[PDB]
Amino acid sequence: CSEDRMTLLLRLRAQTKQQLLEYKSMVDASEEKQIEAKIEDLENEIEEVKVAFEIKKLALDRMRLSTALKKNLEKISRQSSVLMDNMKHLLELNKLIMKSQQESWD
Amino acid sequence: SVLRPLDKLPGLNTATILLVGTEDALLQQLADSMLKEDCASELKVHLAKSLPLPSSVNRPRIDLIVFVVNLHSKYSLQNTEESLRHVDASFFLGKVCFLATGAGRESHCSIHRHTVVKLAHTYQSPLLYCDLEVEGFRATMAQRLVRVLQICAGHVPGVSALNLLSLLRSSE
Amino acid sequence: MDSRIIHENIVEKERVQRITQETFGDYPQPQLEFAQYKLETKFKSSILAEREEPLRCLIKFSSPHLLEALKSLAPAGIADAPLSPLLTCIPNKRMNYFKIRD
Amino acid sequence: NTEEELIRECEEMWKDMEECQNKLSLIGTETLTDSNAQLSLLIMQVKCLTAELSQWQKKTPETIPLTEDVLITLGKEEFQKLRQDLEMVL
Amino acid sequence: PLQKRLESVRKQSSFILTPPRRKIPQCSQLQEDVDPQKVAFLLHKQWTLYSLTPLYKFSYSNLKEYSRLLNAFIVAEKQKGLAVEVGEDFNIKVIFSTLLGMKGTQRDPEAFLVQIVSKSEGKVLWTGWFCCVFGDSLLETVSEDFTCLPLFLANGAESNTAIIGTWFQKTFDCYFSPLAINAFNLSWMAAMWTACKMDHYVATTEFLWSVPCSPQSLDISFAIHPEDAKALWDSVHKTPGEVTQEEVDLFMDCLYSHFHRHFKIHLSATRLVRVSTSVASAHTDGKIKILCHKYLIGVLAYLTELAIFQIE
Amino acid sequence: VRDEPVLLRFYYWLSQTLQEECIWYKVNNYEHGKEFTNFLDTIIRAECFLQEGFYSCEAFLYKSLPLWDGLCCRSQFLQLVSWIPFSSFSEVKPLLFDHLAQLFFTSTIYFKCSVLQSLKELLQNWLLWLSMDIHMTTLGGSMNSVSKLIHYVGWLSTTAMRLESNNTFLLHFILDFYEKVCDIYINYNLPLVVLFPPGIFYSALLSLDTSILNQLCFIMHRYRKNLTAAKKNELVQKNFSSKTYQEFNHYLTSMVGCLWTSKPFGKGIYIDPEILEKTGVAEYKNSLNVVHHPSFLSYAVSFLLQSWYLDYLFSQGLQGLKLFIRSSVH
Known part of the structure; x- marks a missing residue:
C-alpha cells in the first residue's frame, strides 16, 4: 500500500525538479555566423557538466545500494525470496550469453 | 490575445497539445491516433482552426503547438501565415513544430516544398512529413508526436525543450 | 465520446450548421446537373481603379448531383456560412441560367 | 519517516515555483515578423543557454538519505526487469 | 568522369536555393528549312506526354530497316496465331520520317516521327514524336553512344502506343514514363501565356477547378475575355521583361477575390486542373494542345525541361 | 568490367525502377507491398556480392529519406544504407545523417538498435575499403572522416542513453559497436x-x-x-x-x-x-x-x-x- 504512495511521490518530485529548473532558467534569462559558435560552445559545456552530475549521482546511489545490500546478506540466504529464483535465472542466462559472444567473435 | 508558454502552473502528470489546421477531419483522425494508445502520462488534445483562440481562463497551459500545412491548398498556407503572428517569441524555443501533409501525391501539390522549407528555417523549428490519409503512417506520426510532447512537458529527467531544440537542429 | 479531446470553435460549427439547415432546408434536394452564370460587373479591389468598363465573365457549375454538393461546402470549410443568394435560389426561382449586371 | 520529508520538499518546490511564476508574469509579450525572426530567436537562444549553463552549474547531488527497505524493493524491481532484458539479448 | 558529374548534378538538386525567375516568351520567326505542311499537321491535335531515357545505339542512317522491322512486329502482334514474314507488304505500313527546324540549339539532336498508315496515300492512324529542345543540362552527363530525346508525344489509340513502346524498350533499352503537370506549373503557364503579345485573340481564357468534396463531386469553370485578362495582368506587372512569383500570386489572388466577392466560395482551397488560352491548352494529366505556330519552341522547351527534371 | 555504357544503362534502368516501384515516394500505391520488399532483397543480395553498391540506390536514398516514416521497409532500407561509398563526413552529413538523427531521437528503442547495427556495418565496410588503398585526398584527410563519424555516433549513443533511462538492451548494442x-x-x-x-x-x-x-x-x-x-x-x-x-x-x-x-x-x-x-x-x-x-x-x-x-x-x-x-x- 505504501509503495504506491512512495512511487507517486518519487515521480512527482522528479517532475517538479525538472519544471522548477526550467522556471528558474526562464526567470534568470528574462533579466550571424559568429553566434552559432557561441551556441555550440554553450551546449557543449552544458553536456559536459550534465554528464558529470549524472555520473556522480549514479555512483552515490550504487554505493548506497551496495552497502545496504551487504548489511543484510544472511537474510537473503536463509528464507531469501523469489529473488533467489530471479538470481538462478540470471545465472543461467549469463553463461549462454557469454558463449554466444565467443562464438560470434570467432 | 497573445499565447504565452508559462502563464499557468503545470498539472499533476498531465501533458497538453494543441493542433491548428483548416481540415478538421484530419485533425480529428490525428487526435484519435494519438489517444488510441496507453502511456504513463495523462494526455489532452485541443483542436483549433486559427489564432488567436476564443478567450477563456479554464484552458490549462499549452506544452506543444503543431501547425498542419496542407500542400494541396494555398488557403491553409495563408491561414498558418496569419496565425504565426499571434504567438510570442518565447514559444519558438523548442515548443513549435510544422507538419506538412500531401507530399506523396506530387501531381496534386499546389505549393512548392521550398516554400515550407524556408518557412520552417525562418522560425527555427523542425519540419515533419506525413500523409494523414493513410492510417499506417498516421499511427507512427502520432507516436512520434506523443514522444515529443512527453519530452517538452518535462516528464524526462535531464532533457528539456531547449535541449530538443539542439537535438533536432539542421546543418544547412 | 472521448472526453479527452476538446473541440474549440464549436459555437462557430453549430452556427454554420444552423445557417446551412435554415438556408437549404431539410427536404430532399431535386437532382440537377448544370448551372450557368453570366457576369458583367465591375472589378472592385489600386488595381484597375481608373477602369470604367465591366469585366465580362462566364461561369459554369457542373456536378453529377447539383444542390447536394453545394450544401456540403460550408460544413467542409470551403465557403462561408451564408452562401450567395445566386446559388440558393435555383428551385425557388425556377431558373437555371442567370445574367448579372452592375 | 521520509514520506513527510518528501512531502515538505515538494511543498517548498511548489511554493518556489509559484513565486517564480508570479515574478515572471510581469513581462510584456513580444511578437515576431517574417523579417526580424531569425536574429531575434538566435539572441534569445544565446541568452537562454547562458542562463541554463549557470543553472546547471549551481546543481549539487542531494543526499536525502532514505531507509534500506526501499532500496531492497528497488533492487528487486531492477533485477526483475533485467531478467527479460537478458532473455531478449540472448 | 561523366558518372561523377551525373552524381554531382543529381545530389545538387536540394530545396535550399531559391528558384529563379523566367523570361517572357518572345515570338520568333521559325527557320525556313522546316516543312510548313508538317507544322500545320502538328497543330490543333491533342498529344499525350511521356519522358524517355537516352536511346542506346540509335543511328539516323538506317531508318528504312527500323520501319520494316516495326511493321513486321506490329503485324505479327495483331494476329496472335500465325507467322509473318519481314519483307511482306501488309494492309498497314510504318513510316519513319525526319523533322527539321525543331531543335533549340545546334547541339540538340534532330527530331523524327513514326507514323502508322492504312493504305487503300492512306489514312494516318497513330503518330509518335520524339523531341529535345534546350537539353544542354542532359547532354553533358551522357556518353557518345547514346541519343538524348527526353520528350515523347503520342497521338492515337493507347493499344498501338503500348506496342510501339514495348518494341522501343526491347530494341534500344529505354524507359517510357508518364509525365504529369501539377497546379504549380499550370499556374505558371497561365501567367507566362497571358504575358505574351498576340495580334488577334481566337479563344477566351479558361480555367478549370476541381472542388474537393469527396463524398460529392463538383467542377467549376471560369472563362474570361482575353482583353480583360491582359488588362488585369498589365495592372499588376511591374518587372520589365520578366515574370516573378509574386506577380503570379497577385494575378491569381485577383481572380480569387473576384470570385469570392460574388459566390462567397474560397477558390484557393480547390485544385487547378486545366488551363486554356489563345496560344495553347494544358491539362493536369499530361495533355497539351498547341494553337499558335509562333510560340512552339517555348512550350517545347518548357516540356523538355520538365521531362529532364523527371528523368534526373 | 568498369565500363561506362553498361554502368549508365544499369543506372538509368535501376533508378527508373526504384522511382516507379516505391511505396511512399511520388505515388500512394500500397498495392506493390511484398513485391518491393522482394526487389530490395534481390538488390541487397546482389550488392553483397561485388563488394560495393550502385549509385542508383544512393540517389534513391538521398531522394526518399526525408519522406520516410521508419516502419515500411526498415530492414531493407537500413541494409541499403550500409552500402554507401566512402566520402567526406561534412558533405554526406546534411543529406543523410540529419534526417537519420531526426528520425532516431523520436522513435522507439528497436529503431535505435537497428540504426546502431547499420552504422556498425557502414563503419566496417568503410574500414575494409580503406585498408586496401594503403597497399596501392591522402590518409590524413581520410582518417578525419571516420574520426568524426565515431564522435557523431558516440554523441548519438550518449543522448540515447540519457533518453531511454539507461536501458541495457541499448548498452549492449553500444558496446557491440565499440568492440569493432x-x-x-x-x-x-x-x-x-x-x-x-x-x-x-x-x-x-x-x-x-x-x-x-x-x-x-x-x-x-x-x-x-x-x-x-x-x-x-x-x-x-x-x-x-x-x-x-x-x-x-x-x-x-x-x-x-x-x-x-x-x-x-x-x-x-x-x-x-x-x-x-x-x-x-x-x-x-x-x-x-x-x-x-x-x-x-x-x-x-x-x-x-x-x-x-x-x-x-x-x-x-x-x-x-x-x-x-x-x-x-x-
Whole structure:
C-alpha cells in the first residue's frame, strides 16, 4: 500500500525538479555566423557538466545500494525470496550469453 | 490575445497539445491516433482552426503547438501565415513544430516544398512529413508526436525543450 | 465520446450548421446537373481603379448531383456560412441560367 | 519517516515555483515578423543557454538519505526487469 | 568522369536555393528549312506526354530497316496465331520520317516521327514524336553512344502506343514514363501565356477547378475575355521583361477575390486542373494542345525541361 | 568490367525502377507491398556480392529519406544504407545523417538498435575499403572522416542513453559497436585510436548486468593491446596524441580502483567522504569490489551455500575478466 504512495511521490518530485529548473532558467534569462559558435560552445559545456552530475549521482546511489545490500546478506540466504529464483535465472542466462559472444567473435 | 508558454502552473502528470489546421477531419483522425494508445502520462488534445483562440481562463497551459500545412491548398498556407503572428517569441524555443501533409501525391501539390522549407528555417523549428490519409503512417506520426510532447512537458529527467531544440537542429 | 479531446470553435460549427439547415432546408434536394452564370460587373479591389468598363465573365457549375454538393461546402470549410443568394435560389426561382449586371 | 520529508520538499518546490511564476508574469509579450525572426530567436537562444549553463552549474547531488527497505524493493524491481532484458539479448 | 558529374548534378538538386525567375516568351520567326505542311499537321491535335531515357545505339542512317522491322512486329502482334514474314507488304505500313527546324540549339539532336498508315496515300492512324529542345543540362552527363530525346508525344489509340513502346524498350533499352503537370506549373503557364503579345485573340481564357468534396463531386469553370485578362495582368506587372512569383500570386489572388466577392466560395482551397488560352491548352494529366505556330519552341522547351527534371 | 555504357544503362534502368516501384515516394500505391520488399532483397543480395553498391540506390536514398516514416521497409532500407561509398563526413552529413538523427531521437528503442547495427556495418565496410588503398585526398584527410563519424555516433549513443533511462538492451548494442571500434589498428593496420566518452564507460561500469562488465573488461584489454602495439611501431614510423594515452590510463585506474585495489575515488568518481559520513557509509573502500558489487551478488549467494572463489567465477564463463586480470597483473 505504501509503495504506491512512495512511487507517486518519487515521480512527482522528479517532475517538479525538472519544471522548477526550467522556471528558474526562464526567470534568470528574462533579466550571424559568429553566434552559432557561441551556441555550440554553450551546449557543449552544458553536456559536459550534465554528464558529470549524472555520473556522480549514479555512483552515490550504487554505493548506497551496495552497502545496504551487504548489511543484510544472511537474510537473503536463509528464507531469501523469489529473488533467489530471479538470481538462478540470471545465472543461467549469463553463461549462454557469454558463449554466444565467443562464438560470434570467432 | 497573445499565447504565452508559462502563464499557468503545470498539472499533476498531465501533458497538453494543441493542433491548428483548416481540415478538421484530419485533425480529428490525428487526435484519435494519438489517444488510441496507453502511456504513463495523462494526455489532452485541443483542436483549433486559427489564432488567436476564443478567450477563456479554464484552458490549462499549452506544452506543444503543431501547425498542419496542407500542400494541396494555398488557403491553409495563408491561414498558418496569419496565425504565426499571434504567438510570442518565447514559444519558438523548442515548443513549435510544422507538419506538412500531401507530399506523396506530387501531381496534386499546389505549393512548392521550398516554400515550407524556408518557412520552417525562418522560425527555427523542425519540419515533419506525413500523409494523414493513410492510417499506417498516421499511427507512427502520432507516436512520434506523443514522444515529443512527453519530452517538452518535462516528464524526462535531464532533457528539456531547449535541449530538443539542439537535438533536432539542421546543418544547412 | 472521448472526453479527452476538446473541440474549440464549436459555437462557430453549430452556427454554420444552423445557417446551412435554415438556408437549404431539410427536404430532399431535386437532382440537377448544370448551372450557368453570366457576369458583367465591375472589378472592385489600386488595381484597375481608373477602369470604367465591366469585366465580362462566364461561369459554369457542373456536378453529377447539383444542390447536394453545394450544401456540403460550408460544413467542409470551403465557403462561408451564408452562401450567395445566386446559388440558393435555383428551385425557388425556377431558373437555371442567370445574367448579372452592375 | 521520509514520506513527510518528501512531502515538505515538494511543498517548498511548489511554493518556489509559484513565486517564480508570479515574478515572471510581469513581462510584456513580444511578437515576431517574417523579417526580424531569425536574429531575434538566435539572441534569445544565446541568452537562454547562458542562463541554463549557470543553472546547471549551481546543481549539487542531494543526499536525502532514505531507509534500506526501499532500496531492497528497488533492487528487486531492477533485477526483475533485467531478467527479460537478458532473455531478449540472448 | 561523366558518372561523377551525373552524381554531382543529381545530389545538387536540394530545396535550399531559391528558384529563379523566367523570361517572357518572345515570338520568333521559325527557320525556313522546316516543312510548313508538317507544322500545320502538328497543330490543333491533342498529344499525350511521356519522358524517355537516352536511346542506346540509335543511328539516323538506317531508318528504312527500323520501319520494316516495326511493321513486321506490329503485324505479327495483331494476329496472335500465325507467322509473318519481314519483307511482306501488309494492309498497314510504318513510316519513319525526319523533322527539321525543331531543335533549340545546334547541339540538340534532330527530331523524327513514326507514323502508322492504312493504305487503300492512306489514312494516318497513330503518330509518335520524339523531341529535345534546350537539353544542354542532359547532354553533358551522357556518353557518345547514346541519343538524348527526353520528350515523347503520342497521338492515337493507347493499344498501338503500348506496342510501339514495348518494341522501343526491347530494341534500344529505354524507359517510357508518364509525365504529369501539377497546379504549380499550370499556374505558371497561365501567367507566362497571358504575358505574351498576340495580334488577334481566337479563344477566351479558361480555367478549370476541381472542388474537393469527396463524398460529392463538383467542377467549376471560369472563362474570361482575353482583353480583360491582359488588362488585369498589365495592372499588376511591374518587372520589365520578366515574370516573378509574386506577380503570379497577385494575378491569381485577383481572380480569387473576384470570385469570392460574388459566390462567397474560397477558390484557393480547390485544385487547378486545366488551363486554356489563345496560344495553347494544358491539362493536369499530361495533355497539351498547341494553337499558335509562333510560340512552339517555348512550350517545347518548357516540356523538355520538365521531362529532364523527371528523368534526373 | 568498369565500363561506362553498361554502368549508365544499369543506372538509368535501376533508378527508373526504384522511382516507379516505391511505396511512399511520388505515388500512394500500397498495392506493390511484398513485391518491393522482394526487389530490395534481390538488390541487397546482389550488392553483397561485388563488394560495393550502385549509385542508383544512393540517389534513391538521398531522394526518399526525408519522406520516410521508419516502419515500411526498415530492414531493407537500413541494409541499403550500409552500402554507401566512402566520402567526406561534412558533405554526406546534411543529406543523410540529419534526417537519420531526426528520425532516431523520436522513435522507439528497436529503431535505435537497428540504426546502431547499420552504422556498425557502414563503419566496417568503410574500414575494409580503406585498408586496401594503403597497399596501392591522402590518409590524413581520410582518417578525419571516420574520426568524426565515431564522435557523431558516440554523441548519438550518449543522448540515447540519457533518453531511454539507461536501458541495457541499448548498452549492449553500444558496446557491440565499440568492440569493432577498439581493434582498428590491429585489424586494418590503420593508425587510429578513439575512446568512448566517459558517460558510456561509467554507465557500463556501474551496471547490474554481468555480461556488460565482461564486455567492458574485454574492450579495455583490447584497447591496451592496441595501444602498446601502436606505441612500439610509432618509434619505427618516427603522431599519436599523448592526451588520449593519459585519458586511457585514468579509465584503467578507475577500473582497478573498484576491482581489487580498494581505491574507487579516482578522477571520475570525485565524491568527498563527508557525504558518505552523513549518509552512514563506513566501509566504502571495498563497496564495489568483486564480492560486494550489486552485479556479482547472485554469484556470491551461489558461493555462500557451498574464499578463493575467483576460479569459480572463471569457470562460470567470465573470460573477459580473466583476460583483463591476467593482462593487468602481469
